[PDB]
XYZ file of C-alpha atoms in Angstrom:
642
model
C -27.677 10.862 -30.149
C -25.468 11.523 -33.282
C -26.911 13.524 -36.195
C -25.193 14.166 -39.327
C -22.687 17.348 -39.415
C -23.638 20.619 -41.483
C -19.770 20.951 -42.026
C -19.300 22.989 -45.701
C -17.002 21.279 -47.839
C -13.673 22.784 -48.333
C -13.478 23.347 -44.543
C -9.765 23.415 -43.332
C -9.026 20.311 -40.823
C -7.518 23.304 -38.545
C -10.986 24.554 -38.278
C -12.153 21.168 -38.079
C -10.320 21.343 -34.641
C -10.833 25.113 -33.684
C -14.221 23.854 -33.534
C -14.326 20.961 -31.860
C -11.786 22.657 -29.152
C -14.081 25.352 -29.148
C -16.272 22.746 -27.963
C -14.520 20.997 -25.698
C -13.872 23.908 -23.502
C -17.201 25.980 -23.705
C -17.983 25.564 -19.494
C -21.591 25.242 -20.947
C -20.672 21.987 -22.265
C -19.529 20.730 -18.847
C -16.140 18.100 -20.077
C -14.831 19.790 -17.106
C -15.537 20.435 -13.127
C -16.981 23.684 -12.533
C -15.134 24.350 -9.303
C -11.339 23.147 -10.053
C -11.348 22.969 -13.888
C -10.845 18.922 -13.773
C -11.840 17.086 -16.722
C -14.218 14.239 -16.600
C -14.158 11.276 -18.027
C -17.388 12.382 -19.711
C -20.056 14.228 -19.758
C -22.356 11.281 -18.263
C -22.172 10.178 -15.021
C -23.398 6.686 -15.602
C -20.895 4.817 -17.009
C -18.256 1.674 -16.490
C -15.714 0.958 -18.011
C -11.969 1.523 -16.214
C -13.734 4.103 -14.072
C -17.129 2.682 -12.798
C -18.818 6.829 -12.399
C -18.605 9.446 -14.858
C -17.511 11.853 -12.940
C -14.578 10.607 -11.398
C -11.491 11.932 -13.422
C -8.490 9.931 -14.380
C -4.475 10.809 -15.134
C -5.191 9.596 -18.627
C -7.860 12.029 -18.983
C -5.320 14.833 -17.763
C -2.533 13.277 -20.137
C -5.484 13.786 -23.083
C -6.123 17.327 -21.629
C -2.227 18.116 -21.923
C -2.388 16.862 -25.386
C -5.474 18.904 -26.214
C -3.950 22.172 -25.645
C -0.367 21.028 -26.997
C -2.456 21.261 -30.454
C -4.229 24.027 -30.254
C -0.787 26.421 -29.257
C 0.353 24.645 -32.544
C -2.522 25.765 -34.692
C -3.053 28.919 -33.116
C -0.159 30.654 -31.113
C -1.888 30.564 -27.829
C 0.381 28.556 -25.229
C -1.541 29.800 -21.893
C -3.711 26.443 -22.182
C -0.716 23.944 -21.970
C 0.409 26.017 -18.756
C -3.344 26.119 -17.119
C -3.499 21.885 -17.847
C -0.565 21.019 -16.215
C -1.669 23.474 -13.268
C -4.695 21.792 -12.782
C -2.578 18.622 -13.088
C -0.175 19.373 -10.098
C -2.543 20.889 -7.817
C -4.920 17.677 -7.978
C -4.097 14.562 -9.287
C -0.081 14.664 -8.329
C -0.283 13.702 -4.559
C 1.874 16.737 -3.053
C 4.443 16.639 -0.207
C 1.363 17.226 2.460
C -0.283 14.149 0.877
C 2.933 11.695 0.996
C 3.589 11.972 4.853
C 6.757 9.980 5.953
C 8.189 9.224 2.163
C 11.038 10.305 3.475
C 11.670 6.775 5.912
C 11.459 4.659 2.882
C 14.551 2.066 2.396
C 15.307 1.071 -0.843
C 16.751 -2.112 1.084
C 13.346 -3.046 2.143
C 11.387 -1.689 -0.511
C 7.954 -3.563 0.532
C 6.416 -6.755 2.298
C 5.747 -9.420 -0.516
C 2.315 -10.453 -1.084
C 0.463 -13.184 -3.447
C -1.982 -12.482 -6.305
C -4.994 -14.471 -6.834
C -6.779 -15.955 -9.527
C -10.045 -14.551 -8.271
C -11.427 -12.043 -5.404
C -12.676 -14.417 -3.452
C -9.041 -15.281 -2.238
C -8.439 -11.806 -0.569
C -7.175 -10.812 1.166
C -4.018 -11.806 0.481
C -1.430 -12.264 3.303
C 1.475 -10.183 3.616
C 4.602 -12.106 4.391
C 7.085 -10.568 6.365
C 8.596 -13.845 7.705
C 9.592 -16.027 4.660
C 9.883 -14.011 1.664
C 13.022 -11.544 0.933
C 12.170 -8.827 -1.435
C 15.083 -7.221 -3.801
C 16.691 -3.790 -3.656
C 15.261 -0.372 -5.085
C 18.245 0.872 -7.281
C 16.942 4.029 -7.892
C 14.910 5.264 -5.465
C 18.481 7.209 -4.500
C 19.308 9.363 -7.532
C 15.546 10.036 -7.770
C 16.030 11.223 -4.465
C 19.224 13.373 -4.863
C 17.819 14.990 -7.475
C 14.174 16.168 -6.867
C 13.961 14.845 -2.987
C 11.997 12.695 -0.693
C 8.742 12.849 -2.771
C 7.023 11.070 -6.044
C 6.108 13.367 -9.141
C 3.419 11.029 -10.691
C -0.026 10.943 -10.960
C -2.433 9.058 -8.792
C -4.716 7.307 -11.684
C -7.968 8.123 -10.210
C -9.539 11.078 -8.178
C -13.288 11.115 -7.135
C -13.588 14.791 -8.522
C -16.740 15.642 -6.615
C -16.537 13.571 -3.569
C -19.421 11.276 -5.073
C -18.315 7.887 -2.721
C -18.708 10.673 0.132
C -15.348 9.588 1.315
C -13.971 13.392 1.843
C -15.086 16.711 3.114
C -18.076 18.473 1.493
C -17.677 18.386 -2.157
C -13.872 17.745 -2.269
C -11.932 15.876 -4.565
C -10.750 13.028 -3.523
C -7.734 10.294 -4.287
C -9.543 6.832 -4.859
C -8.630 3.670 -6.101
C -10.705 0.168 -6.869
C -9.053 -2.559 -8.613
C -6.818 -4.146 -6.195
C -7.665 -8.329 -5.911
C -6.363 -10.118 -8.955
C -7.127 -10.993 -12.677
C -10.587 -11.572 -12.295
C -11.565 -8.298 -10.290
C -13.590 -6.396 -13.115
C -14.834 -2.937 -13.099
C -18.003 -4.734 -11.299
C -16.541 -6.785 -8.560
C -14.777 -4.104 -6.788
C -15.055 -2.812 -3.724
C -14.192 1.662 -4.365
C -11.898 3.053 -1.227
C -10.604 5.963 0.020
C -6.693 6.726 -0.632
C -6.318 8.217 2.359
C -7.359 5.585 4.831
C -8.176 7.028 8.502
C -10.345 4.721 9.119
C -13.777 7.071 8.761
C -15.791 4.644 6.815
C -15.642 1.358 5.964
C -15.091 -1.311 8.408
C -13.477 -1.239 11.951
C -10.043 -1.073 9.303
C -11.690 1.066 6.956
C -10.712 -1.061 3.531
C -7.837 -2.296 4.468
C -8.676 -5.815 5.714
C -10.423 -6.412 2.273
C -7.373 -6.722 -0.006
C -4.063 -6.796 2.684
C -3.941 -9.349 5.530
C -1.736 -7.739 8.028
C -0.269 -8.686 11.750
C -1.889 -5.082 12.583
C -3.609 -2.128 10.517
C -2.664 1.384 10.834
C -4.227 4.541 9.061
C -1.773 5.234 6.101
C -1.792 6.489 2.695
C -1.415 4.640 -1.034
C -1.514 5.368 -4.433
C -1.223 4.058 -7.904
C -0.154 5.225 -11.408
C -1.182 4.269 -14.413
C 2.132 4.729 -16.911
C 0.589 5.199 -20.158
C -0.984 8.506 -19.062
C 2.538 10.162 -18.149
C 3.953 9.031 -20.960
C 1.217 10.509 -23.204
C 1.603 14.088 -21.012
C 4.683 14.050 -22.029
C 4.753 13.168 -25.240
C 2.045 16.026 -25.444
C 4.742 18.163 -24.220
C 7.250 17.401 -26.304
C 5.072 18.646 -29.466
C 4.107 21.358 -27.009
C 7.779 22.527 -27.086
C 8.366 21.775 -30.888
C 5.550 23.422 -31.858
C 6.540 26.958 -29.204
C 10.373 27.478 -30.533
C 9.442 27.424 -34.103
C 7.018 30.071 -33.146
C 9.240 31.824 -31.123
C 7.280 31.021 -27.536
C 9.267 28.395 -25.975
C 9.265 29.981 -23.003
C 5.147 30.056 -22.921
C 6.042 26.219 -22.006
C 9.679 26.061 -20.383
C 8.344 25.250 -17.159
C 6.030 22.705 -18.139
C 8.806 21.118 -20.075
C 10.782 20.484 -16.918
C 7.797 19.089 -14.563
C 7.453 17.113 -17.528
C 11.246 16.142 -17.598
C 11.293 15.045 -14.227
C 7.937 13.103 -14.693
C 9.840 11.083 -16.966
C 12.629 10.267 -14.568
C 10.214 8.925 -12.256
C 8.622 6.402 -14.924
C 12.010 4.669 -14.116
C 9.430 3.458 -11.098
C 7.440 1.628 -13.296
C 10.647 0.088 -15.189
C 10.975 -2.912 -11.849
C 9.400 -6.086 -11.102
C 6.515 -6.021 -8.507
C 8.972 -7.177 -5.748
C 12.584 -6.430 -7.026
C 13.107 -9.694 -8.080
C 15.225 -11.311 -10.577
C 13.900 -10.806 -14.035
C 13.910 -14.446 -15.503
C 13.932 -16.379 -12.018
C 10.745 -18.297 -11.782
C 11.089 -18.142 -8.414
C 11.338 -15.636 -5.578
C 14.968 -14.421 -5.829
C 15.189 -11.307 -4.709
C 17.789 -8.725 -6.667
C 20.493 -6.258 -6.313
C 21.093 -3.724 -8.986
C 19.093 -3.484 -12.378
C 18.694 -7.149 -12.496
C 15.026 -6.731 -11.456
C 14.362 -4.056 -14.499
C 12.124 -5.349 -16.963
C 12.698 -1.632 -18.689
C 9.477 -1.666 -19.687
C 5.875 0.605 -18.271
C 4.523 -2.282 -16.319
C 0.784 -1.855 -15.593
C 1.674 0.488 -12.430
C 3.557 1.846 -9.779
C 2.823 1.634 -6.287
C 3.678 3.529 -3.175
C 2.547 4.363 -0.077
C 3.032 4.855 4.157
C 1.613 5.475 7.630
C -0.841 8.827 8.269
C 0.494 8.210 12.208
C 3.660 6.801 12.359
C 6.360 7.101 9.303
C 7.419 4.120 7.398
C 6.829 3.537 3.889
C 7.127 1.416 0.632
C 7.016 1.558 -3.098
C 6.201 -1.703 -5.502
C 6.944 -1.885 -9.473
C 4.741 -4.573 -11.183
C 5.682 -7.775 -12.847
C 2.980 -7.531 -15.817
C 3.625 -5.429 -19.006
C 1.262 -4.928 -21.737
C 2.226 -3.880 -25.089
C -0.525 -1.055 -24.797
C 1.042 0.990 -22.075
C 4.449 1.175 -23.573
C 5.602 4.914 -25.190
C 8.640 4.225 -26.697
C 8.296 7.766 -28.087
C 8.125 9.481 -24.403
C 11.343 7.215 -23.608
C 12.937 8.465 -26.604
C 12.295 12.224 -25.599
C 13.997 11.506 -22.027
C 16.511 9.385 -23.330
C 17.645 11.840 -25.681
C 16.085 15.353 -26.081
C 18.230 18.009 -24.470
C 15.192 20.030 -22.811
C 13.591 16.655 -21.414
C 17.688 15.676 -20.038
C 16.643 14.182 -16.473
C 18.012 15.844 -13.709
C 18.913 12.194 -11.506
C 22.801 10.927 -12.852
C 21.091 7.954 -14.006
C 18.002 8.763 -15.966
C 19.209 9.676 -19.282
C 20.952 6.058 -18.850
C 17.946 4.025 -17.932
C 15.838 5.708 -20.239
C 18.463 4.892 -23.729
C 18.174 1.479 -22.425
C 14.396 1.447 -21.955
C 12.981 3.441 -25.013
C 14.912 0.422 -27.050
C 13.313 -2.259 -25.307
C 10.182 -1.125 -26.251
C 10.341 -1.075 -29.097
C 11.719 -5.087 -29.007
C 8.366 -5.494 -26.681
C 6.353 -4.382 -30.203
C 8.356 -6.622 -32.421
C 8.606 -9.585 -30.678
C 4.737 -8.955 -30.153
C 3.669 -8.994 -33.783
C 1.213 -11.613 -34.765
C 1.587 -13.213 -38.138
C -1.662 -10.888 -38.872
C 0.478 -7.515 -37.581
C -1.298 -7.034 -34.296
C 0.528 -6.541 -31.440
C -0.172 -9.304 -28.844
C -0.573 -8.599 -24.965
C 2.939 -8.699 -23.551
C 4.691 -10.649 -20.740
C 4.995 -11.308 -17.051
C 7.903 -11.490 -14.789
C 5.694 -13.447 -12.095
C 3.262 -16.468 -13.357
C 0.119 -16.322 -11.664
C 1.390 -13.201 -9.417
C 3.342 -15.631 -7.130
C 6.431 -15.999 -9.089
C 6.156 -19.721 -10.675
C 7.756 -21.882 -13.020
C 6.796 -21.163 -16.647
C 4.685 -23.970 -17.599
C 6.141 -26.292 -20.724
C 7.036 -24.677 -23.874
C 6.240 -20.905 -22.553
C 7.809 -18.466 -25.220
C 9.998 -16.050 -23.473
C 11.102 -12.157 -24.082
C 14.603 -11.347 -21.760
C 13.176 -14.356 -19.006
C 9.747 -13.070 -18.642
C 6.476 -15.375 -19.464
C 4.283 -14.180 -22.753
C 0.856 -13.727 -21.896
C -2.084 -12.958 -24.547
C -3.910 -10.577 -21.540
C -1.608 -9.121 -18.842
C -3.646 -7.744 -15.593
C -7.411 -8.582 -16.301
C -8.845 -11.341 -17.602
C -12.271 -9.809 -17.082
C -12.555 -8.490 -19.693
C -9.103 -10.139 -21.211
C -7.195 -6.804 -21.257
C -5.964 -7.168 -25.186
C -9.346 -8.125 -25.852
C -9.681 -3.984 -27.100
C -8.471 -2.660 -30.657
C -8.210 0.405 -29.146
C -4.457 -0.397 -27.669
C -3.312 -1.199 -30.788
C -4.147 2.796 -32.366
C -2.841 3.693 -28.770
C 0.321 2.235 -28.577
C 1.227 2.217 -32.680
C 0.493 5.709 -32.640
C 3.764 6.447 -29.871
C 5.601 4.165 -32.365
C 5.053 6.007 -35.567
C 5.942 9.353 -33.684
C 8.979 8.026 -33.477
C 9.569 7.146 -36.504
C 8.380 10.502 -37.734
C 11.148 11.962 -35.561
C 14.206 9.521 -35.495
C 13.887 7.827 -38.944
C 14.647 4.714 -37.173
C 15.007 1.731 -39.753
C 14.822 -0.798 -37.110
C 11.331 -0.029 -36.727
C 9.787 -0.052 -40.361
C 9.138 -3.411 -40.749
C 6.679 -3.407 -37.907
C 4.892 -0.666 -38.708
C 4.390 -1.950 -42.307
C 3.093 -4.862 -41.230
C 0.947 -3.454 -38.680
C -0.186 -0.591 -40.934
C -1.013 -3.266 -43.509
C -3.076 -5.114 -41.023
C -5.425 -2.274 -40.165
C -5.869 -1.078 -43.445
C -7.533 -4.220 -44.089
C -9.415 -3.829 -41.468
C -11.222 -0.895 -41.258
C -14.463 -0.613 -43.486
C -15.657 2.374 -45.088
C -19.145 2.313 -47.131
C -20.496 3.569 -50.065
C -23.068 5.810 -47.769
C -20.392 7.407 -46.002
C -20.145 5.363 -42.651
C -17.588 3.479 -41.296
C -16.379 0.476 -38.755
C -13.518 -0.415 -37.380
C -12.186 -3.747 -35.326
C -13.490 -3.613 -32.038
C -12.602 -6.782 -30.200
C -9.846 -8.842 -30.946
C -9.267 -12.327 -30.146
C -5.450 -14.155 -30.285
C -4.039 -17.563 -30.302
C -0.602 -19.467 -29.839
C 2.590 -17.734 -29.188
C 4.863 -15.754 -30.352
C 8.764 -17.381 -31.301
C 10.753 -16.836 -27.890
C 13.098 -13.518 -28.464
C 16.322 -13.651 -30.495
C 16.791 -9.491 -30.688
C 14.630 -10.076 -34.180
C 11.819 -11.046 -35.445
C 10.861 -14.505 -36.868
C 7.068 -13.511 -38.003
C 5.701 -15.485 -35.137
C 3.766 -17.519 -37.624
C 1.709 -19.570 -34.660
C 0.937 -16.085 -33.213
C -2.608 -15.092 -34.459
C -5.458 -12.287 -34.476
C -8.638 -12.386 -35.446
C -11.315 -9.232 -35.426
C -14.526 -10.935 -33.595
C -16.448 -7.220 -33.860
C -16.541 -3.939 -35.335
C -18.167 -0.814 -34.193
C -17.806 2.686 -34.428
C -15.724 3.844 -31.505
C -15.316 7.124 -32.110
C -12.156 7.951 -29.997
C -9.986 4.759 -31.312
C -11.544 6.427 -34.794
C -9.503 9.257 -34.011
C -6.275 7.806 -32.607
C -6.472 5.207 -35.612
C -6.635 8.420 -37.842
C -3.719 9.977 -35.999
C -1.664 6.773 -36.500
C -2.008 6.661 -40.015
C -1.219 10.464 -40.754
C 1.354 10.263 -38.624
C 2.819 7.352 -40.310
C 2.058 8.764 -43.509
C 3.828 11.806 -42.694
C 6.621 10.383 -41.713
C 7.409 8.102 -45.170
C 7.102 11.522 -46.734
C 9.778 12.851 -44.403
C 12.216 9.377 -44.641
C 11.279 7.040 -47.728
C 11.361 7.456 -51.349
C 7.430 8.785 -51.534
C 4.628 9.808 -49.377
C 2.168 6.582 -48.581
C -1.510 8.662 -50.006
C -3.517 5.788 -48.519
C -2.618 6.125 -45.124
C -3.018 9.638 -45.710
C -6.365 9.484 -47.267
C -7.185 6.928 -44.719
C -6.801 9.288 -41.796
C -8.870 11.615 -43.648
C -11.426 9.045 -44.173
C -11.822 8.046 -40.805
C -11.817 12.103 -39.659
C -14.452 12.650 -42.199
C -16.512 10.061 -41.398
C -16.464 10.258 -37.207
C -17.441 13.899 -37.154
C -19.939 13.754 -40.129
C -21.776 10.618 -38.697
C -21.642 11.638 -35.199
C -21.895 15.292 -34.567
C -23.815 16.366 -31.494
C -26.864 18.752 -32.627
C -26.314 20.675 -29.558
C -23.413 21.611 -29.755
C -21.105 19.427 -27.398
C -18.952 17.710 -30.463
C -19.462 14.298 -31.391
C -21.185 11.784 -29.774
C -21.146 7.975 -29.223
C -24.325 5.780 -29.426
C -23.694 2.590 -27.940
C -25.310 -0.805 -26.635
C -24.354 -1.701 -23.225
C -24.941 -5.490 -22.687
C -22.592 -5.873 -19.763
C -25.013 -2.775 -17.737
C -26.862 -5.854 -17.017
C -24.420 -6.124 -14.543
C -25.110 -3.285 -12.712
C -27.735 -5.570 -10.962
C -26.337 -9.368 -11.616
C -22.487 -9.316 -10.556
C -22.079 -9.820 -6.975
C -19.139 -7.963 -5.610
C -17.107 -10.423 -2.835
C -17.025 -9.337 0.544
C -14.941 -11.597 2.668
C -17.191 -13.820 5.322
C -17.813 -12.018 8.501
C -16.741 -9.028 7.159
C -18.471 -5.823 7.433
C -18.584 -2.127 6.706
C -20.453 1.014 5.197
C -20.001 3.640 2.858
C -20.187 7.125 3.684
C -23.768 7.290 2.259
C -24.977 4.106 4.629
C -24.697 1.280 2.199
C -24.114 -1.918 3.474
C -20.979 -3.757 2.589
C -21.675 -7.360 3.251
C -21.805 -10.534 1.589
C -23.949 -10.629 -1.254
C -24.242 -7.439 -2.286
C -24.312 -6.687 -6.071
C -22.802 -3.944 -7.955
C -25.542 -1.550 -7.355
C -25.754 -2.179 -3.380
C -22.625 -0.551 -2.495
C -23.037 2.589 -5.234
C -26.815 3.204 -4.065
C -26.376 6.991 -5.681
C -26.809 5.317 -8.851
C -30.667 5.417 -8.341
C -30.772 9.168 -8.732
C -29.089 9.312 -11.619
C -30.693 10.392 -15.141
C -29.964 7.548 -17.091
C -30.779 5.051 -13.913
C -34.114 4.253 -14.979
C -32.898 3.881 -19.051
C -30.572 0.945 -17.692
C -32.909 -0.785 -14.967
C -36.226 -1.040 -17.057
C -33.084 -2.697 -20.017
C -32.340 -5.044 -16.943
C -36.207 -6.015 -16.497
C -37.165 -6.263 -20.380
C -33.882 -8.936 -20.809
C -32.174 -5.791 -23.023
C -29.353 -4.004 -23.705
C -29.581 -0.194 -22.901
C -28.670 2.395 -25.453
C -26.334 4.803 -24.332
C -24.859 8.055 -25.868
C -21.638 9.656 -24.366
C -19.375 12.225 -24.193
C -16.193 10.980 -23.001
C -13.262 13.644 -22.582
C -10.713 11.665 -24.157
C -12.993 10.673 -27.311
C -13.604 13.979 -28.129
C -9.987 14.523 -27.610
C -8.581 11.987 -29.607
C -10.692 13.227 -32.237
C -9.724 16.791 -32.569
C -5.854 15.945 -32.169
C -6.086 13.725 -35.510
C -7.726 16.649 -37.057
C -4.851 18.729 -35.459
C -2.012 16.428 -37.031
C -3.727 16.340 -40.395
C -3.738 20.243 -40.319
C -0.079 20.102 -39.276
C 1.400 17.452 -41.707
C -1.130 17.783 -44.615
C -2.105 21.491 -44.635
C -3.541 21.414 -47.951
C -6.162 18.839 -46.776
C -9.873 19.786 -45.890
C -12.855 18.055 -44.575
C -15.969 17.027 -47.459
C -19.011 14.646 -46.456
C -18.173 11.322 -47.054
C-alpha cells in the first residue's frame, strides 16, 4: 500500500509531474495494454465500480489519457504524445465505418422504436412499441451528415481490452456494454454483452431478449457514449492547442484539433430527449425541430443497426446530471475559431448549449453550494406527469440522482471537483461575470470541507447526501434555501484529491487574471491537497501513488443476485450458466483466478470488508494534471512535506 514520499523539499510541481508521468507511462508499470497501448482502468483487475473488471478500458479513461499528454507538451515541448493518444483513441474505442454497417439507412423521421424504463431489472425486458407510440424527429442527424457523412465520431464507453468475457477472437478487444435495465441495475446486477451481437454466445438471441422485447431478433450492432469523456478530450485539446502556438508547435496538434472539432459537433447527439419528444410535455408528444433539445450532455447517446440487413436508429436520453455537463468544451465549439464545427448548425447549437449549462449549475446550487443532481425530461422513463409541487428547469422534472439509484448517482463528491473544475476553466478563459457567484459559493463550500491535519494528512467529503428542492428556474438564482447537502463521509480519494486541487488553482488563477487580487487560499489549498496525496500515498515501487481502500459492497461479489428473466437461458463464452439465481460471481467465473480473489472471498466468509490498494489510470492522472496546472499558473510554487 501507500508509504510516505522521499520527495526533497523545494522540488518544482513540474517535476512533481515529470515524475509521476514518468510513471504513468514506464510499460513496466503496466497503466496500459501491452499489445495496443490502451489504458486500463487500473492496474488491478479486480475491481467494481462503473466498470465491474480492471482491465476493461473506458472513453473516460482515454479522455484522461488525452489530458495526460496535453500537460506534459505544455511542460515540456514534446507534442508526439497528444498525437499517439488520440491514435490509439480512433483505432479502438471510436466504432469505425466497418463497425457501423447500414448507418447510412437511418431516418431522422423515425429515429427509433419507443420503449419503457423500469424501476427495477426484474421488469425487463421491456417491450418495444411500434404500434402505439410516435417518436419525434432527429433535427440534426442531416447537417451532421452533410458535413462528415453517414457515420458517428464518438466513443463507445466501454471496450473489453483483452477479450476477458471471451466474447471475441483470441485476445481481441472488444466493444461491450452492461448497464441497460433501469435505475436500480447496479454495477452487480448486470448481465455484460457483446456489442456486436451475432448471436455466438448467449442465448438462442444472444442478449438481446434480456433487455429488448421484440416481434423478431436479428444480429445487429449498438453502442453507447458516455458525454463527459468527449467533452474532457476535448477540453484536453483545447489546452493542447493553447499550450502548442505559444510554443510555436501548433501544428504538432492541428490534426487532433479537428477530430476533436468534429467530436464536438456530434455531442449535439447527446443534446435530445431519449425519444425526440417535447421537452416539458409530461406526456408522449413527439417533436419537430429543436423542441425536443434539452441542450444539455444527457447521460448518453445511443445508436445502433442490423449486422444482416440495414436499418438503423439513434436515441438521446431524457436524464441529465449536473456531473456530465462541460460547459467549458461547449464554450470551445461554440466559439473558438480552430474548434469552428464543420455542420451549418453546430457553432449555433453549441452558443445555445454551453449557456444552458451553465443555468443547469446555478439553478443546481444548494443553499450549502453543492451542485444537486439535475433533471429529467421523462418521470420514471415513461414520460409522466410531474408529481405535485415538482420544481422545474425549462419543463424538465428535478431529480436529486438522475440514472442510478443504486448507488444514488450524486451520492459521489467526486462530480462536484469534476464538473466545477470545467466551470472554473471557463472562467479562467472568458471572465464571465455571470458565473462568479456560483463558484464563490461553491468554492466556499468545499473549503469548509476539506480537512487537513496537523500530521500532514488529509480528508475530503466523500458521500454526499441532499434534501428538498431547488426554487423552479427564473433565468437566476434564488439560493434555493430548501435545497440542502450534507457530507455523510470523508476519505482520502486520491483522484477527486487531485481534480479538487485542479479546481481550486484553477479558480485561483483565474481571480488573479479577472478580480482585484489573487485568492492565496485556494491557491495554497491546491497545494495542500497536491502535497498531501503524493506524500501520504506514494507507491514504494515505483508505480505513483496508490489508494488503500475498504470495500464493503465486495461482499457483493457473492450476495447480489443478478435477474435473469424466467425460462430464460444462456452461456458465456467461458461456459457459465446464465440462469435464474445466479449471483454476481456465477456469470464472471474468471474471477476465481484472479490474485486478489482469495483477499475478497475469505473478507466474504470472516463477515469483513476487504482491503484493497489500486492503481486506477485516471487517479494517477488527475493527480499529475493538478500538479501540471500548479506548475503552469503558479510557477514559483514547489512541493514540501506537509
Amino acid at each position: 500500500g501507500p508509504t510516505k514520499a522521499p520527495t526533497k523539499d523545494g522540488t518544482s510541481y513540474k517535476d512533481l509531474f515529470l515524475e509521476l508521468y514518468g510513471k504513468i507511462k514506464d510499460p513496466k508499470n503496466g497503466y496500459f495494454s501491452p499489445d495496443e497501448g490502451i489504458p486500463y482502468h487500473s492496474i488491478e483487475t479486480l475491481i467494481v465500480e462503473a466498470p465491474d473488471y480492471g482491465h476493461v478500458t473506458t472513453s473516460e479513461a482515454f479522455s484522461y489519457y488525452v489530458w495526460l499528454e496535453a500537460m506534459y507538451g505544455n511542460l515540456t515541448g514534446n507534442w508526439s504524445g497528444v498525437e499517439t493518444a488520440w491514435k490509439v483513441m480512433e483505432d479502438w474505442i471510436i466504432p469505425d465505418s466497418t463497425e457501423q454497417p447500414g448507418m447510412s439507412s437511418y431516418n431522422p423521421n423515425s429515429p427509433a422504436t419507443y420503449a419503457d424504463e423500469y424501476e427495477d431489472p426484474s421488469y425487463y425486458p421491456s417491450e418495444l412499441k411500434f404500434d402505439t407510440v410516435r417518436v419525434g424527429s432527429d433535427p440534426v442527424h442531416n447537417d451532421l451528415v452533410s458535413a462528415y457523412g453517414p457515420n458517428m465520431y464518438l466513443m463507445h464507453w466501454l471496450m473489453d481490452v483483452d477479450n476477458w468475457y471471451g466474447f471475441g477472437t483470441g485476445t481481441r478487444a472488444t466493444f461491450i456494454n452492461t448497464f441497460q435495465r433501469g435505475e436500480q441495475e447496479s454495477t452487480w446486477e448486470t448481465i455484460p454483452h457483446p456489442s456486436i451481437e451475432e448471436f455466438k454466445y448467449g442465448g438462442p438471441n444472444g442478449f438481446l431478449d434480456l433487455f429488448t422485447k421484440d416481434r423478431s431478433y436479428a444480429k445487429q450492432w449498438r453502442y453507447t457514449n458516455a458525454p463527459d469523456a468527449e467533452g474532457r478530450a476535448i477540453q484536453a485539446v483545447y489546452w493542447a492547442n493553447k499550450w502548442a502556438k505559444e510554443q510555436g508547435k501548433g501544428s504538432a496538434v492541428a490534426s487532433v484539433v479537428s477530430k476533436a472539432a468534429k467530436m464536438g459537433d456530434f455531442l449535439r447527439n447527446d443534446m435530445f430527449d431519449k425519444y425526440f419528444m417535447k421537452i416539458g410535455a409530461q406526456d408522449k408528444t413527439p417533436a419537430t425541430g429543436y423542441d425536443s433539445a434539452h441542450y444539455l450532455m444527457a447521460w448518453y447517446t445511443a445508436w445502433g443497426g442490423g449486422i444482416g440487413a440495414s436499418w438503423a436508429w439513434k436515441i438521446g436520453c431524457s436524464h441529465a446530471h449536473f456531473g456530465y455537463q462541460n460547459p467549458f468544451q461547449g464554450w470551445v465549439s461554440a466559439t473558438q475559431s480552430d474548434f469552428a464545427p464543420k455542420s451549418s448548425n453546430g457553432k449555433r447549437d453549441w452558443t445555445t448549449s454551453y449557456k444552458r449549462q451553465l443555468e443547469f449549475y446555478q439553478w443546481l446550487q444548494s443553499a450549502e453550494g453543492g451542485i444537486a443532481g439535475g433533471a429529467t425530461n421523462s418521470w420514471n422513463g415513461r414520460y409522466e406527469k410531474y408529481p405535485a409541487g415538482t420544481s422545474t428547469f425549462y419543463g424538465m422534472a428535478y431529480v436529486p440522482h438522475p440514472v442510478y439509484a443504486d448507488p444514488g448517482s450524486n451520492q459521489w463528491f467526486g462530480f462536484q471537483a469534476w464538473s466545477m473544475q470545467r466551470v472554473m476553466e471557463y472562467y479562467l478563459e472568458t471572465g464571465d461575470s455571470s458565473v462568479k457567484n456560483l463558484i464563490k459559493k461553491w468554492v466556499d463550500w468545499v473549503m469548509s470541507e476539506i480537512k487537513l491535519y496537523d500530521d500532514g494528512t488529509f480528508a475530503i467529503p466523500s458521500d454526499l447526501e441532499w434534501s428538498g428542492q431547488p426554487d423552479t428556474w427564473t433565468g437566476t438564482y434564488t439560493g434555493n434555501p430548501n435545497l440542502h447537502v450534507r457530507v455523510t463521509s470523508y476519505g482520502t480519494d486520491l483522484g477527486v484529491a487531485g481534480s479538487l486541487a485542479n479546481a481550486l488553482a484553477t479558480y485561483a488563477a483565474a481571480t488573479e487574471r479577472w478580480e482585484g487580487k489573487l485568492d492565496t487560499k485556494a491557491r495554497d489549498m491546491a497545494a495542500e491537497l497536491v502535497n498531501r496525496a503524493w506524500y501520504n500515498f506514494y507507491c514504494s515501487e515505483g508505480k505513483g501513488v496508490v489508494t488503500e481502500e475498504a470495500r464493503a459492497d465486495y461482499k457483493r461479489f457473492f450476495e447480489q443476485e443478478v435477474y435473469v428473466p424466467a425460462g430464460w437461458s444462456g452461456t458465456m463464452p467461458n461456459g457459465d450458466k446464465i440462469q435464474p439465481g445466479i449471483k454476481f460471481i456465477d456469470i464472471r467465473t474468471k474471477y476465481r483466478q484472479d490474485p486478489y480473489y482469495d483477499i475478497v472471498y475469505q473478507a466474504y466468509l470472516r463477515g469483513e470488508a476487504p482491503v484493497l490498494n489500486y492503481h486506477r489510470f485516471w487517479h494517477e492522472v488527475d493527480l499529475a494534471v493538478a500538479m501540471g496546472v500548479l506548475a503552469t499558473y503558479f510557477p514559483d510554487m514547489t512541493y514540501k512535506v506537509p
